[PDB]
Design a protein around this ligand. Sequence first.
Ligand SMILES: OC[C@H]1O[C@H](O[C@H]2[C@H](O)[C@@H](O)[C@@H](O[C@H]3[C@H](O)[C@@H](O)[C@@H](O)O[C@@H]3CO)O[C@@H]2CO)[C@H](O)[C@@H](O)[C@@H]1O
Ligand SMILES: OC[C@H]1O[C@H](O[C@H]2[C@H](O)[C@@H](O)[C@@H](O)O[C@@H]2CO)[C@H](O)[C@@H](O)[C@@H]1O
Ligand SMILES: [Ca+2]
Length: 712
Amino acid sequence: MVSIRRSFEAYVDDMNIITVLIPAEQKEIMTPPFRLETEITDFPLAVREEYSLEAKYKYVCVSDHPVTFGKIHCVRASSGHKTDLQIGAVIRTAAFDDEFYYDGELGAVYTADHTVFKVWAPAATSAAVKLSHPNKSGRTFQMTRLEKGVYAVTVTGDLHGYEYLFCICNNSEWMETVDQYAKAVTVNGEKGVVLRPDQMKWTAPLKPFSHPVDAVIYETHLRDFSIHENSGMINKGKYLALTETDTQTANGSSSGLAYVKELGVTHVELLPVNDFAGVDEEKPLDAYNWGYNPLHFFAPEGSYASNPHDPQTRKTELKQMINTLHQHGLRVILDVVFNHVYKRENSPFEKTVPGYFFRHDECGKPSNGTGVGNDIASERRMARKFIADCVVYWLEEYNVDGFRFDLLGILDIDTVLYMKEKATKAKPGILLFGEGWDLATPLPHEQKAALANAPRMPGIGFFNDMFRDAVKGNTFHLKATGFALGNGESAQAVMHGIAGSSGWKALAPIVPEPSQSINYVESHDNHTFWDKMSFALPQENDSRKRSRQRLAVAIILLAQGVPFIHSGQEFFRTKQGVENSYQSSDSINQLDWDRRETFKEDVHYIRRLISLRKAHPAFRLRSAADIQRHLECLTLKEHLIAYRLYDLDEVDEWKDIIVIHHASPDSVEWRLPNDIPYRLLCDPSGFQEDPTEIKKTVAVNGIGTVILYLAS
Ligand SMILES: OC[C@H]1O[C@H](O[C@H]2[C@H](O)[C@@H](O)[C@@H](O[C@H]3[C@H](O)[C@@H](O)[C@@H](O)O[C@@H]3CO)O[C@@H]2CO)[C@H](O)[C@@H](O)[C@@H]1O
Ligand SMILES: OC[C@H]1O[C@H](O[C@H]2[C@H](O)[C@@H](O)[C@@H](O)O[C@@H]2CO)[C@H](O)[C@@H](O)[C@@H]1O
Ligand SMILES: [Ca+2]
């Protein structure tokens, strides 16, 4: 690293403390007293303490007046030498935050007449906006510093179509960067772009969603969903593929939009659509990536658009896709990544205000609770502002219906409750949830938005890994098995999950209310359910495995809480044994519409389970108190579980409902709790056309589920 030649060093580590570092073989030359100078300034600096390091001697000096940011400062030694005051740790202090917190809008504010530019850089000494445009003369103008450390400049003319960059001067080193609030960018996100309002109109009004336990989530990646040669869609792997109506596979099976609507799902959860790194937008087929490498939080990814060179195109297509799903009665959830950025050192945050936006350990080095290099410090006031500003923007400008927070456990509770307030006001009924794993990040345990603190985050949901592992088997030991795979040691944990995970017997509650429990058995992370089971049960044929996976679905789909499904799970999706496919090729990640064809019958079974849940509110109790009054366990053995829903007058259309889950191939007899005749609605074979009546006892033959009901 080349660098500015300096006599010695000096940093501002607090609102009134300056740390002076002098090189070893100069200790006797560059000595105290020291003085802080600037235009019209010259005060003395007292020494509180001094001690030697391994290459330098250090002084911790104090000043009578608080340093004033925005102007260049000079530190003078008795020997006459000088050096420029650099930025220290003062940026992470509460005193600094309170002094510079800005509540207005930031970024590029457009008008056909003129454009106003604003950026928050409280510790810088200068700033400028750099404008360019293909064949149109480039210009760079100096910005003026205002209150709260905000720099701005107003440029006359219509700037639609112009590219822009900010130049921020920190520690006498100028850096170039795109606007953190950029709403449009060039190919591969090299620069931001100014664009007039696109005047997009939303023509598919949807009323506020009734309640969380009334939803059915379907997780999918935009490229995976339609890249297969037999997807029946024209815009393969693009935003527009999901807009294509009445699409079908070669053999005539339903696909795309028509397919998702037929299944009965209510919300479609998409993997990251903000601009990320990992795929060359100029040559998208050369690489693949899930999208968890944030570059620009306020703009869309380019590889999913028809044309990534025209700044407006990607925006238009994402909005059309979303509007179209709305027209067909489907809602949208956005996976968002506010816990880290890709390459911290080159990020807009770091180049504008060095060291402010990332958490640090006691040594003064970036923490790594995320495990990928950096942790965004949500607790800083402008960071919290940013996250809330971002969530509201997507809601207002893209009209989505909820968010899935990646690594929710890294964010702080106050920031989460603050954005929740603003988001629900902008869009009543949206869904808000995430993974609240306990992670090693520098925050007191009670301040993390982790699962353990669910009681303090009402209105926020969490992925239920307890229920997940109980049904499938521990996901960190390939060979481990769960109830669905034949392990009776976890049957009680399963009953707990069926009851909404809000307390059972001597088992402590996972969450306070069912609306906070996202029940699932598969996701984009780890082995798919089919692949994991294939490793744990190496001696079982395909027929038996299929029945165990259908069993895992019935357990989840008929449980109290919020059901969540991984795209392709319905037809035993496989990834060739790959455990972490974040960058694998298409042959590994694509949604196989050939397999959806082969197992149309098993997909039909899932479709019927979703229809049942929808037609009977008994499977959708609104609170822990109500569940306590209408749900009770009847039988609980190593391979057999039976519970029932009762007292369903005002509630359900049926009077009594009994559900039996069997996890072994043998055949057994089960005694009903009474002698009244019931209707056999379903058994290990599947649903029955025109229910037959049985009395006192019923047979449970092989792996599967049997459902009995009594009408009114
Ligand atoms: O290139 C940077 C980074 O890439 C790799 O990390 C990726 C993980 O391997 C991959 O599993 C994925 O992880 C994310 C989960 O899918 C998501 O559910 C949630 O848990 O967030 C995770 C990360 O934020 O994505 C990451 C990032 O691309 C590689 O392993 C790292 O060493 C490397 O630093
Ligand atoms: O054309 C600009 C922008 O307009 C709309 O966004 C509005 C939003 O509807 C209002 O509620 C309020 O928040 O102001 C926003 C911006 O002015 C569209 O929703 C959006 O797609 C479009 O880009
Ligand atoms: Ca990109």
